Design a binder for these strands. Structure first.
Ligand SMILES: [K+]
Ligand SMILES: [K+]
Ligand SMILES: [K+]
Ligand SMILES: [K+]
Ligand SMILES: [K+]
Ligand SMILES: [K+]
Ligand SMILES: [K+]
Ligand SMILES: [K+]
Ligand SMILES: [K+]
Ligand SMILES: [K+]
Ligand SMILES: [Mg+2]
Ligand SMILES: [Mg+2]
Ligand SMILES: [Mg+2]
Ligand SMILES: [Mg+2]
Ligand SMILES: [Mg+2]
Ligand SMILES: [Mg+2]
Ligand SMILES: [Mg+2]
Ligand SMILES: [Mg+2]
Ligand SMILES: [Mg+2]
Ligand SMILES: [Mg+2]
Ligand SMILES: [Mg+2]
Ligand SMILES: [Mg+2]
Ligand SMILES: [Mg+2]
Ligand SMILES: [Mg+2]
Ligand SMILES: [Mg+2]
Ligand SMILES: [Mg+2]
Ligand SMILES: [Mg+2]
Ligand SMILES: [Mg+2]
Ligand SMILES: [Mg+2]
Ligand SMILES: [Mg+2]
Ligand SMILES: [Mg+2]
Ligand SMILES: [Mg+2]
Ligand SMILES: [Mg+2]
Ligand SMILES: [Mg+2]
Ligand SMILES: [Mg+2]
Ligand SMILES: [Mg+2]
Ligand SMILES: [Mg+2]
Ligand SMILES: [Mg+2]
Ligand SMILES: [Mg+2]
Ligand SMILES: [Mg+2]
Ligand SMILES: [Mg+2]
Ligand SMILES: [Mg+2]
Ligand SMILES: [Mg+2]
Ligand SMILES: [Mg+2]
Ligand SMILES: [Mg+2]
Ligand SMILES: [Mg+2]
Ligand SMILES: [Mg+2]
Ligand SMILES: [Mg+2]
Ligand SMILES: [Mg+2]
Ligand SMILES: [Mg+2]
Lengths: 100, 153, 68, 384
RNA sequence: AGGAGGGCGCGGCGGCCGCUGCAAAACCCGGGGCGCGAGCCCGGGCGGAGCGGCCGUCGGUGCAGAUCUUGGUGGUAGUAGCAAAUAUUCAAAUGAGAACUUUGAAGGCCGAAGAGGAGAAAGGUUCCAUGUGAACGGCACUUGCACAUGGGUAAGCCGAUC
RNA sequence: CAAGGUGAACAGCCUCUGGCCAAUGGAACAAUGUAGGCAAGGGAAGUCGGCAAAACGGAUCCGUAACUUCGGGAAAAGGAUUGGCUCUGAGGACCGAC
RNA sequence: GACGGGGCAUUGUAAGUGGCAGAGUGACGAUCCACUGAGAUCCAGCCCCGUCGCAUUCGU
């Protein structure tokens, strides 16, 4: 089915104890793993702006939490993962949300 | 061409062959042993699973220093198994050749099984490696010949 | 569709480094058919090949520290 | 030639081989000797290691410098909710040793204990004991049950109860599969034992029916695993000099030229930890009974209302809501590990055995940091 | 240790007697025999053109060794190993096939007595374009300092030359 | 040939131009290694031997022994200070820099 | 299960706004004070519970 949701991924606990030269590369892999389990699609496409956001503090300081939007679409389905808009007051009280 | 085994039902059988294939002989011998009397459709799915790391190939001889996995625990209680991708892809190609040879003969793809599979050593190819104190040592590949006969029964 | 010849030619034509040449990612085929310095020039005038600006190295801090 | 200086050997040869235990639940290797004059009673119990804390008490011990003075002592908390009896097993003597005579099971077995008989409970039809339960419905089936019990009374020399824990009471264990063990009855006659164990079918036996306060017990369990380990940590040998080529964390000489073999007595690298251990003479300081004042961590000297659980829960365990034992000192294994508690095999006629413990204070500060409050109420009143 | 006799086998030459495309030599065989033995004779197969036995005589004439010579092949073994020079990621394109090719974006390194830009020795086409069977580029490649086909070095003032 | 900052400085560290991410990749963190750290209390008891490591370190002010070929020894030894900010004074040319 | 909330814990009072606080200088100005035991992080192997998901074999 075609559906779009907004998730908060806790990257801090997924990357705990990771090697410095692999923390940003592993965050990208954890994002792919998250989408495969959340929507069930083996094909996960990471948006370029989401790639920039993960890398915006270098290879070392990945953001602890990232609000992402995952849109599952028909090709055979694939997930498109993009950076979601953060409301004011941060991520406090924010669960998984359905878009449209 | 004469294979090492006659079909014993030549009208109801198809064959495929490959000489001097650049793939390790020891890896391919174990792969060929794992599907000895297998049905053609189960053999294809097994080899795709090996390519996808979902089913291991049991290494019985030529097994010294091979890890243990638990994917091979059935039909090999000690965990000695591996996933030789090149040896699996090369056999898969031969299985597709024999399958199309059977379709030309009109034999049904269903109820087809491997009645004969054989891996023989091809002539080795030479490369070179360099050692300490100005010494040269051989660096050799071990290609193989593969023979394959599918039979209805 | 390798463009390694076009990037080398554009670098020479625009008088910059290869790291300052920008080839339009949406015009990969149009740039590809070019094989002469004259064609590269026509692509520069059209706007498919651009010399990227210098990386910014500001002297603000040195000026501020010198006044201090 | 002889060695230049003497020192005792590193490690004990009495715990060999230092391998992984073949079981997870600790096993009683010897029950206490049966005294047929005493009333029928159980000799063992199963529990789960919650965590450690420290207590303060005033010591009554003449001749000691600690006499009439307070001491601080570390204690382990073992959560021990009641066991359910689900069967009986009889043993007869034989020139080859004891042999199981027969067993009788109860009509109702919970699914927690029935999970113990399956590798994959949710993929199965869950047929275990479904046809055995039909003997309790007909009249020929009930005749067999009574005949088996009468055979127990006539031929058995050892009678043991089959009991399981209520593992779902401890939610933090995250386990639905109960632990099952055989416990010996150590009183009365064989007919007394059979009658006593049969009346307990599908019934809960609390920890107070087995142990009492200020009693020395033995704790059986599997220690914490540590994986492959070198000789320095596994056996406690000394390191070599810093100058040592090819590393310094080895045994230098692993044997003489003759015998031309390595001996079983030389320290080698291998598995460290996860071993079966039987530790004895652990004193019970407290029996916390659910639904009673003894469950709280308040003493006669400290009337503060608090629970046994430290602030923020027992780290890696959770909250203790069932019955528990406070035991002096350390205990085998990590947190959540199932531990077997056994009555002492020897007579405890000693001052430490016969001492009466009176607690003055129980610490309930958080163990997840440098905790400084005893309750959440105190922490909130401090910050406003 | 050593000596001697009588025999078995290999290759020629002089003689004698034969065989073979209705299948010679060589080679293979849980085939059958003879001889104490060295050896010999036959059978079945392969192979496709030469070979044998007896008398005499002659010789580069018989192998298990020589850290023997040359060639081939094992176990070791799918093992030891592929770890210096901070580092990659995303999207797209191409292609049978992309961790490694190309484009864009991002994150990093060399840090100007450089991992930049040019020369003298030395090399000799490695330079550029197009194309790609295999080999090679100690993983891979659609890719190249590989391979194939073409193209390319202009002086009165720069040098040699004096 | 050879830029900006810090700094005495072509030291080390960071950056611009230009050039590069080529050094087989993926999964996991056992023993033993290799390279690099920390460690209470003691302080060479270790060892043939302080091997290795640690401590010292720039600049400013004070102060500096025996011995001496009178040149040195000498940075002997031994002490004190050092950030940021807001100012103040002095030192010039025909408005300026340290 | 994924978030989230609370508990527990570590560090030590966030950004921003305001102040007739502030050596002095001709608006600047280290710093200080209030909101503010604040802010940030907290299982990755911590504790307790409003939003969203969910093929291969074996017969004694
Ligand atoms: K192995
Ligand atoms: K000795
Ligand atoms: K110890
Ligand atoms: K030592
Ligand atoms: K002759
Ligand atoms: K000239
Ligand atoms: K290690
Ligand atoms: K010493
Ligand atoms: K603030
Ligand atoms: K405050
Ligand atoms: Mg190995
Ligand atoms: Mg080498
Ligand atoms: Mg050399
Ligand atoms: Mg002695
Ligand atoms: Mg025993
Ligand atoms: Mg040495
Ligand atoms: Mg703690
Ligand atoms: Mg044979
Ligand atoms: Mg002859
Ligand atoms: Mg001759
Ligand atoms: Mg000779
Ligand atoms: Mg020989
Ligand atoms: Mg010999
Ligand atoms: Mg030899
Ligand atoms: Mg040789
Ligand atoms: Mg060899
Ligand atoms: Mg290896
Ligand atoms: Mg190496
Ligand atoms: Mg690479
Ligand atoms: Mg550097
Ligand atoms: Mg740098
Ligand atoms: Mg050049
Ligand atoms: Mg070239
Ligand atoms: Mg290669
Ligand atoms: Mg060439
Ligand atoms: Mg000239
Ligand atoms: Mg210079
Ligand atoms: Mg300066
Ligand atoms: Mg410098
Ligand atoms: Mg290398
Ligand atoms: Mg690796
Ligand atoms: Mg110390
Ligand atoms: Mg001292
Ligand atoms: Mg000494
Ligand atoms: Mg000594
Ligand atoms: Mg000495
Ligand atoms: Mg030294
Ligand atoms: Mg001196
Ligand atoms: Mg929480
Ligand atoms: Mg967990």
């Amino acid at each position: 089915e075609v559906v779009t949701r907004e998730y908060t991924v806790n990257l801090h606990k997924r990357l705990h104890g990771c090697t410095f030269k692999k923390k940003a590369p592993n965050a990208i892999k954890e994002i792919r793993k998250f989408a495969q389990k959340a929507m069930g699609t083996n094909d996960v496409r990471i948006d370029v702006k989401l790639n920039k956001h993960i890398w915006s503090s270098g290879i070392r300081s990945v953001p602890r939490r990232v609000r992402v939007r995952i849109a599952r679409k028909r090709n055979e389905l694939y997930s498109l993962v993009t950076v979601a808009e953060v409301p004011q007051e941060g991520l406090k009280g924010l669960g998984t949300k359905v878009v449209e | 061409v004469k294979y090492s085994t006659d079909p014993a039902n030549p009208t109801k059988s198809a064959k495929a062959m490959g000489r001097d294939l650049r793939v390790h002989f020891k890896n391919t011998r174990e792969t060929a042993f794992a599907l000895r009397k297998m049905s053609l459709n189960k053999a294809k799915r097994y080899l795709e699973d090996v390519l996808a790391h979902k089913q291991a190939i049991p290494f019985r001889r030529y097994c010294r220093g091979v890890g243990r996995t638990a994917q091979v625990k059935n039909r090999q209680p000690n965990g000695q198994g591996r996933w030789p991708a090149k040896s699996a892809k090369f056999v898969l190609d031969l299985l597709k050749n024999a399958e199309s040879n059977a379709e030309v003969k009109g034999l049904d793809v269903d109820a087809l099984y491997i009645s004969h599979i054989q891996v023989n050593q091809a002539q080795k190819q030479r490369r070179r490696t360099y050692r300490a104190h100005g010494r040269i040592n051989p660096y050799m590949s071990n290609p193989c010949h593969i023979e394959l006969i599918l039979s209805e029964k | 569709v390798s463009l390694k010849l076009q990037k080398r030619l554009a670098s020479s034509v625009l008088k910059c480094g290869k790291g300052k040449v920008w080839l339009d990612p949406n015009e990969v085929n149009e740039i590809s058919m070019a094989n002469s310095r004259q064609n590269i020039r026509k692509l520069v005038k059209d706007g498919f090949i651009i010399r990227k600006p210098q990386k910014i190295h500001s002297r603000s801090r040195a000026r501020r520290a010198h006044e201090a | 030639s002889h060695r230049k200086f003497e020192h005792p050997r590193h490690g004990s040869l009495g715990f060999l081989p230092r391998k992984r235990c073949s079981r997870h639940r600790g096993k009683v290797k010897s029950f206490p000797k049966d005294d047929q004059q005493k009333p029928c009673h159980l000799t063992a119990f199963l529990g789960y290691k919650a965590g450690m804390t420290h207590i303060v008490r005033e010591v009554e011990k003449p001749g000691s410098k600690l006499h009439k003075k307070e001491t601080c002592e570390a204690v382990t908390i073992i959560e021990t909710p009641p066991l359910v009896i689900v069967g009986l097993v009889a043993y007869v003597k034989t020139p080859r040793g004891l042999r199981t005579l027969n067993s009788v099971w109860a009509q109702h077995l919970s699914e927690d204990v029935r999970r113990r008989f399956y590798k994959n409970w949710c993929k199965s039809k869950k047929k275990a004991f479904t046809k055995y339960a039909l003997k309790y419905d007909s009249d020929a089936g009930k005749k067999e049950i009574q005949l088996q019990l009468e055979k127990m009374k006539k031929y058995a020399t050892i009678v043991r109860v089959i009991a399981h824990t209520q593992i779902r009471k401890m939610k933090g264990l995250k386990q639905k599969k109960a632990h099952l063990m055989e416990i010996q009855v150590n009183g009365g006659t064989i007919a007394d034992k059979v009658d006593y164990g049969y009346k307990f079918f599908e019934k809960e036996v609390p920890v107070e029916a087995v142990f009492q306060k200020d009693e020395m017990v033995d704790i059986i369990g599997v220690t914490k695993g540590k994986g492959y380990e070198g000789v320095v940590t596994r056996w406690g040998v000394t390191r070599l000099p810093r100058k040592t080529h090819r590393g310094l964390r080895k045994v230098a000489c692993i044997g003489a030229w003759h015998p031309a073999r390595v001996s079983y007595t030389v320290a080698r690298a291998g598995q460290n930890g996860y071993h079966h251990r039987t530790e004895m003479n652990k004193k019970i300081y407290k029996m916390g009974k659910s639904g009673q004042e003894s469950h709280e961590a308040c003493t006669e000297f400290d009337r503060t209302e608090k629970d046994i659980t430290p602030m923020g829960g027992f780290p890696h365990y959770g909250v203790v809501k069932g019955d528990y034992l406070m035991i002096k000192g350390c205990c085998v294994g990590p947190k959540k590990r199932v531990v077997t508690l056994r009555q002492s095999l020897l007579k405890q006629t000693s001052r430490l055995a016969l001492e009466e413990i009176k607690l003055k204070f129980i610490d309930t500060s958080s163990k997840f940091g440098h905790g400084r409050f005893q309750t959440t109420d105190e922490k909130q009143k401090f910050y406003g």
